[PDB]
Amino acid sequence: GPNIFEMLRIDEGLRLKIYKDTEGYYTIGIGHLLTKSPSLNAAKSELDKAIGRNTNGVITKDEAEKLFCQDVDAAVRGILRNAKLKPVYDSLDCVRRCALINMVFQMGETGVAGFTNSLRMLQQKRWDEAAVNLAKSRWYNQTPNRAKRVITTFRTGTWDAYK
Amino acid sequence: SIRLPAHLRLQPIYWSRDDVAQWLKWAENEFSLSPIDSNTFEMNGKALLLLTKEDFRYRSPHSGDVLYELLQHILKQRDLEAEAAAAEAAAKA
Amino acid sequence: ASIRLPAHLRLQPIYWSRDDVAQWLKWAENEFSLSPIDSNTFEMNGKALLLLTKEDFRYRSPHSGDELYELLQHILKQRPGGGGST
Ligand SMILES: [N+]
């Protein structure tokens, strides 16, 4: 590539059939949930509404791409609707925009907005300081795997941490 | 060196029946071959590629082997261009 | 030796006309004491001649074809450099 799709194909991963992530809830495609009912009964029903057709899934490789892209769109809309996130996002170039979306896929719009200091540092074109800042957070501890690459992307403003 | 007419620089599998006919006219003059009748190869390029060297010889006793080896040379150079464009497309993406 | 080389033909076969190819066969037959070669065994120029395989030479000339192919290769070895055929 490198592009926005490759980013979460590495981080959150593409799996095909329904799997459980590093927590317990059901996830299909790339980080799509699913899944309000505590069983594989309603995680099987909301997918009929989402895809357009039927059963189980097991969904095709391309339907998951569409699913992923619809969720990236949902992430972007959520970001721009957010009063704490939009001003940060609008000042960012597309490489760094992908990194903020990456964060939203994981901890959600509301979770990201809590990084007040690091967001302001990203807004004011102050990359390394936000990179040192984000590193000293609770999210960094759980999975240093995903976090290192998102930080590297924020600092350099390039896709290097994936090439 | 072999320089095809610019309109024939496509992979022979995409050659129309007319393209095939223009190939023969060009080859005749380029290689000083005995006149090749227009209807010796009434087929498109993807048909032409299924023919054996024996088939070329039956159709053109004077020039069949030349036409066949010419086609092999054309196929080879296109195959190289295909893997030069392939390695570069993967290099960018 | 070696030389083994035509005296009145260009040493670069890629420039040979249909007539030059016929004279090369005529010279070859005499120089190498070959069986008589029909002039219309290679109705083609030097460019076309360089596309043929050893197998094609043999098909056109059962008695002398391999000889003529190696003779053609010998002419290309000395002199340098190309072509050929791209
Ligand atoms: N040859």
Coordinates of C-alpha atoms and ligand atoms in Angstrom, one line a residue:
Chain A
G1 CA 0.0 0.0 0.0
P2 CA 0.0 1.8 2.3
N3 CA -3.5 3.0 3.1
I4 CA -6.3 3.2 5.8
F5 CA -7.5 -0.4 5.1
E6 CA -4.1 -1.9 5.7
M7 CA -3.8 -0.1 9.0
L8 CA -6.7 -2.1 10.7
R9 CA -6.0 -5.3 8.7
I10 CA -2.8 -5.4 10.9
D11 CA -4.1 -3.9 14.1
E12 CA -7.7 -5.2 14.7
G13 CA -7.3 -7.9 12.0
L14 CA -9.6 -9.4 9.3
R15 CA -11.4 -12.5 10.4
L16 CA -14.0 -14.1 8.5
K17 CA -16.3 -16.1 10.3
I18 CA -17.3 -14.7 13.8
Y19 CA -14.5 -14.6 16.3
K20 CA -14.0 -13.2 19.9
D21 CA -11.4 -10.4 20.3
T22 CA -9.1 -9.7 23.3
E23 CA -12.1 -9.3 25.6
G24 CA -15.1 -11.6 24.8
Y25 CA -17.7 -9.9 22.6
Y26 CA -18.3 -11.2 19.0
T27 CA -16.5 -9.4 16.2
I28 CA -16.9 -9.9 12.4
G29 CA -15.0 -8.4 9.5
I30 CA -12.7 -5.7 10.8
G31 CA -13.8 -4.7 14.3
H32 CA -17.5 -4.7 13.6
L33 CA -19.9 -5.4 16.5
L34 CA -22.7 -7.3 16.2
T35 CA -24.0 -8.1 19.3
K36 CA -26.1 -6.6 22.1
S37 CA -27.7 -9.9 23.1
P38 CA -25.4 -12.3 25.2
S39 CA -25.6 -15.0 22.6
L40 CA -24.8 -16.0 18.9
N41 CA -28.6 -15.6 18.3
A42 CA -28.9 -11.8 17.7
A43 CA -25.3 -11.5 16.5
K44 CA -26.8 -13.7 13.7
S45 CA -29.9 -11.5 13.1
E46 CA -28.5 -7.9 12.9
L47 CA -26.2 -9.1 10.1
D48 CA -29.2 -9.8 7.9
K49 CA -30.1 -6.1 8.2
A50 CA -26.5 -5.0 7.7
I51 CA -25.3 -7.0 4.7
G52 CA -28.6 -6.9 2.8
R53 CA -29.0 -10.6 2.5
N54 CA -29.0 -13.7 4.8
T55 CA -27.1 -16.3 7.0
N56 CA -24.9 -16.9 9.3
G57 CA -22.0 -15.5 8.8
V58 CA -19.4 -16.4 7.4
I59 CA -19.4 -13.5 5.0
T60 CA -17.4 -12.9 1.8
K61 CA -14.1 -11.1 1.7
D62 CA -15.5 -8.1 -0.2
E63 CA -18.7 -7.7 2.0
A64 CA -16.4 -7.2 5.0
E65 CA -14.5 -4.5 3.0
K66 CA -17.8 -2.7 2.4
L67 CA -18.7 -3.3 6.1
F68 CA -15.3 -1.9 7.1
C69 CA -15.7 1.2 4.9
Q70 CA -19.2 1.9 6.2
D71 CA -17.7 1.8 9.7
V72 CA -14.8 4.2 8.7
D73 CA -17.6 6.5 7.5
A74 CA -19.3 6.1 10.8
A75 CA -16.1 6.9 12.6
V76 CA -15.5 10.1 10.5
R77 CA -19.1 11.3 11.0
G78 CA -18.8 10.6 14.8
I79 CA -15.5 12.5 14.9
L80 CA -16.9 15.5 13.0
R81 CA -20.1 15.5 15.1
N82 CA -18.0 15.6 18.3
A83 CA -17.2 19.1 19.6
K84 CA -14.0 17.9 21.2
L85 CA -12.7 15.9 18.2
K86 CA -13.7 17.8 15.1
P87 CA -11.4 20.8 15.6
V88 CA -8.4 18.4 16.1
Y89 CA -9.4 16.3 13.1
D90 CA -9.9 19.2 10.7
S91 CA -6.4 20.4 11.3
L92 CA -4.9 17.0 10.6
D93 CA -3.6 15.7 7.2
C94 CA -5.0 12.4 5.9
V95 CA -2.2 10.2 7.3
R96 CA -2.8 11.4 10.8
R97 CA -6.6 11.4 10.3
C98 CA -6.3 7.6 9.8
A99 CA -4.5 7.3 13.1
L100 CA -7.3 9.1 15.0
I101 CA -9.9 6.8 13.2
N102 CA -7.8 3.8 14.2
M103 CA -8.2 5.0 17.9
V104 CA -11.9 5.4 17.5
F105 CA -12.4 1.8 16.1
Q106 CA -10.9 0.5 19.3
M107 CA -12.0 2.7 22.3
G108 CA -14.7 4.6 20.5
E109 CA -15.4 8.3 19.9
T110 CA -16.1 9.1 23.6
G111 CA -13.0 7.3 24.8
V112 CA -10.6 9.1 22.5
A113 CA -12.1 12.5 23.4
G114 CA -10.7 12.0 26.9
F115 CA -7.1 12.5 25.6
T116 CA -7.5 16.3 26.0
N117 CA -3.8 17.1 26.4
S118 CA -2.6 14.8 23.6
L119 CA -5.4 16.0 21.2
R120 CA -4.6 19.7 21.8
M121 CA -0.9 18.9 21.1
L122 CA -1.9 17.1 17.9
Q123 CA -4.0 20.2 16.9
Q124 CA -1.2 22.7 17.4
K125 CA 1.2 20.7 15.1
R126 CA 3.3 19.4 18.1
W127 CA 3.9 15.8 17.2
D128 CA 6.6 14.4 19.4
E129 CA 5.1 15.8 22.6
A130 CA 1.8 14.1 21.9
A131 CA 3.8 11.0 21.0
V132 CA 5.5 11.0 24.5
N133 CA 2.1 11.9 26.0
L134 CA 0.0 9.1 24.5
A135 CA 2.7 6.6 25.5
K136 CA 2.0 7.3 29.2
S137 CA -1.7 6.2 29.1
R138 CA -3.8 3.2 30.3
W139 CA -4.5 2.3 26.6
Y140 CA -0.8 2.0 25.9
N141 CA -0.4 -0.6 28.6
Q142 CA -3.1 -3.1 27.5
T143 CA -1.7 -3.5 24.0
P144 CA 1.7 -1.9 23.3
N145 CA 1.4 -3.7 19.9
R146 CA -1.2 -1.5 18.4
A147 CA -0.2 1.7 20.3
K148 CA 3.4 1.9 19.1
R149 CA 2.4 2.1 15.4
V150 CA -0.4 4.6 16.0
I151 CA 2.0 6.9 17.9
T152 CA 4.8 6.5 15.2
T153 CA 2.1 7.6 12.6
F154 CA 1.2 10.6 14.7
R155 CA 4.8 11.8 15.0
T156 CA 6.3 11.3 11.5
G157 CA 3.0 11.8 9.7
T158 CA 3.8 8.8 7.4
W159 CA 2.9 5.2 7.0
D160 CA 6.4 4.0 8.0
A161 CA 5.4 1.9 11.0
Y162 CA 3.6 -0.5 8.5
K163 CA 5.9 -0.6 5.5
Chain B
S1 CA 15.7 -5.6 -33.2
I2 CA 12.0 -6.3 -33.8
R3 CA 9.8 -3.3 -34.0
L4 CA 6.1 -4.1 -34.5
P5 CA 3.6 -1.5 -35.9
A6 CA 2.5 0.5 -32.9
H7 CA -1.1 -0.8 -33.2
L8 CA 0.1 -4.4 -32.8
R9 CA 2.1 -3.8 -29.6
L10 CA -0.7 -5.3 -27.5
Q11 CA -0.5 -8.9 -26.3
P12 CA -1.4 -11.2 -29.2
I13 CA -4.3 -12.7 -27.2
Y14 CA -6.1 -9.4 -27.7
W15 CA -5.5 -9.3 -31.4
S16 CA -8.6 -9.1 -33.6
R17 CA -8.7 -11.1 -36.9
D18 CA -7.7 -7.9 -38.7
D19 CA -4.7 -7.4 -36.3
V20 CA -3.6 -10.9 -37.3
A21 CA -3.9 -10.0 -41.0
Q22 CA -1.9 -6.8 -40.5
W23 CA 0.7 -8.8 -38.6
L24 CA 1.2 -11.1 -41.6
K25 CA 1.4 -8.2 -44.2
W26 CA 4.0 -6.5 -41.9
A27 CA 5.9 -9.8 -41.4
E28 CA 6.0 -10.5 -45.2
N29 CA 7.7 -7.2 -46.0
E30 CA 9.9 -7.0 -42.8
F31 CA 11.2 -10.5 -43.4
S32 CA 11.2 -10.6 -47.2
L33 CA 9.0 -13.7 -47.2
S34 CA 7.0 -15.1 -50.1
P35 CA 3.5 -13.5 -50.4
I36 CA 1.2 -14.7 -47.6
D37 CA -2.4 -15.0 -48.7
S38 CA -4.9 -12.9 -46.6
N39 CA -7.0 -16.0 -45.8
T40 CA -4.2 -18.3 -44.5
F41 CA -5.0 -17.3 -40.9
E42 CA -8.8 -16.6 -40.7
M43 CA -8.9 -16.2 -37.0
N44 CA -8.2 -13.8 -34.1
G45 CA -5.1 -13.8 -31.9
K46 CA -6.4 -16.1 -29.2
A47 CA -7.1 -18.7 -31.9
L48 CA -3.7 -18.1 -33.5
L49 CA -2.0 -18.9 -30.1
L50 CA -3.6 -22.4 -30.0
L51 CA -1.9 -23.4 -33.3
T52 CA 1.3 -25.5 -33.3
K53 CA 4.4 -24.9 -35.4
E54 CA 3.2 -27.8 -37.6
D55 CA -0.1 -25.9 -38.1
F56 CA 1.9 -22.8 -39.2
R57 CA 3.9 -24.9 -41.6
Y58 CA 0.7 -26.5 -43.1
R59 CA -0.9 -23.1 -43.6
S60 CA 2.3 -21.4 -44.8
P61 CA 4.8 -23.9 -46.2
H62 CA 7.2 -21.1 -47.1
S63 CA 7.1 -18.9 -43.9
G64 CA 5.2 -20.8 -41.2
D65 CA 8.2 -21.5 -39.0
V66 CA 9.3 -17.8 -39.3
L67 CA 5.8 -16.6 -38.4
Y68 CA 5.7 -19.1 -35.5
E69 CA 9.1 -18.0 -34.0
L70 CA 8.2 -14.4 -34.6
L71 CA 5.1 -14.9 -32.5
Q72 CA 7.2 -16.6 -29.8
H73 CA 9.4 -13.5 -29.7
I74 CA 6.5 -11.2 -29.5
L75 CA 5.0 -13.2 -26.7
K76 CA 8.3 -13.2 -24.8
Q77 CA 8.8 -9.4 -25.0
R78 CA 5.2 -8.7 -23.9
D79 CA 5.6 -11.2 -21.0
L80 CA 8.7 -9.2 -19.9
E81 CA 6.8 -5.9 -20.1
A82 CA 4.0 -7.5 -18.0
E83 CA 6.4 -8.5 -15.2
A84 CA 8.1 -5.1 -15.4
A85 CA 4.7 -3.4 -14.8
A86 CA 3.9 -6.0 -12.2
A87 CA 7.0 -5.6 -10.0
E88 CA 6.6 -1.8 -10.2
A89 CA 2.8 -1.8 -9.2
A90 CA 3.8 -3.8 -6.2
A91 CA 6.7 -1.5 -5.5
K92 CA 4.3 1.5 -5.3
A93 CA 1.6 -0.4 -3.5
Chain C
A1 CA 39.4 -21.0 -40.4
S2 CA 37.7 -19.0 -39.3
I3 CA 37.1 -17.7 -42.2
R4 CA 34.8 -19.8 -42.5
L5 CA 33.6 -16.3 -43.4
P6 CA 32.0 -15.0 -46.6
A7 CA 34.2 -12.5 -48.5
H8 CA 31.5 -10.5 -50.3
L9 CA 28.7 -10.5 -47.7
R10 CA 28.3 -8.3 -44.7
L11 CA 29.4 -10.0 -41.5
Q12 CA 26.2 -8.9 -39.8
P13 CA 23.4 -11.3 -41.0
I14 CA 20.7 -8.9 -39.8
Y15 CA 21.4 -6.7 -42.9
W16 CA 21.2 -9.6 -45.4
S17 CA 18.6 -9.4 -48.1
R18 CA 16.8 -12.4 -49.5
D19 CA 19.5 -12.5 -52.2
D20 CA 22.3 -12.3 -49.6
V21 CA 20.9 -15.3 -47.8
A22 CA 20.9 -17.3 -51.2
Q23 CA 24.5 -16.3 -51.8
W24 CA 25.5 -17.4 -48.3
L25 CA 24.0 -20.9 -49.0
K26 CA 25.9 -21.0 -52.3
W27 CA 29.1 -20.0 -50.6
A28 CA 28.4 -22.5 -47.8
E29 CA 27.8 -25.4 -50.1
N30 CA 31.2 -24.8 -51.9
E31 CA 33.3 -23.9 -48.8
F32 CA 32.0 -26.9 -46.8
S33 CA 31.5 -29.5 -49.6
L34 CA 27.9 -29.9 -48.6
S35 CA 25.1 -31.6 -50.6
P36 CA 23.5 -29.2 -53.1
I37 CA 21.2 -26.7 -51.4
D38 CA 18.1 -25.5 -53.3
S39 CA 18.1 -21.7 -53.3
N40 CA 14.5 -21.6 -52.2
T41 CA 15.1 -23.4 -48.9
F42 CA 15.4 -20.1 -47.0
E43 CA 13.1 -17.7 -48.9
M44 CA 13.7 -14.9 -46.4
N45 CA 16.2 -12.2 -45.3
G46 CA 18.8 -12.4 -42.5
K47 CA 16.4 -11.0 -39.9
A48 CA 14.1 -13.9 -40.5
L49 CA 17.0 -16.3 -40.7
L50 CA 18.1 -15.3 -37.2
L51 CA 14.6 -16.2 -35.8
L52 CA 14.8 -19.8 -36.9
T53 CA 15.8 -22.5 -34.5
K54 CA 18.3 -25.3 -35.2
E55 CA 15.3 -27.6 -35.5
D56 CA 13.9 -25.3 -38.3
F57 CA 17.2 -25.3 -40.1
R58 CA 17.1 -29.2 -40.0
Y59 CA 13.5 -29.3 -41.3
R60 CA 14.5 -27.0 -44.3
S61 CA 17.8 -28.8 -44.9
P62 CA 17.9 -32.4 -43.6
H63 CA 21.4 -32.9 -45.0
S64 CA 23.1 -29.6 -44.0
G65 CA 20.7 -27.7 -41.7
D66 CA 22.5 -28.2 -38.4
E67 CA 25.8 -27.3 -40.2
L68 CA 24.3 -24.0 -41.6
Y69 CA 22.9 -23.1 -38.1
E70 CA 26.3 -23.5 -36.5
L71 CA 27.8 -21.7 -39.4
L72 CA 25.4 -18.8 -38.8
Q73 CA 26.3 -18.8 -35.1
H74 CA 30.0 -18.9 -36.0
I75 CA 29.5 -15.7 -38.1
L76 CA 27.8 -14.0 -35.2
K77 CA 30.6 -15.0 -32.7
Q78 CA 33.1 -13.1 -34.9
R79 CA 32.4 -10.3 -35.4
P80 CA 30.8 -8.5 -32.4
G81 CA 28.4 -7.7 -31.2
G82 CA 24.6 -8.0 -31.4
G83 CA 22.0 -8.0 -32.6
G84 CA 19.6 -9.4 -31.9
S85 CA 16.8 -10.0 -32.2
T86 CA 15.9 -7.0 -29.9
Ligands
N1 N 19.0 -18.7 -36.5

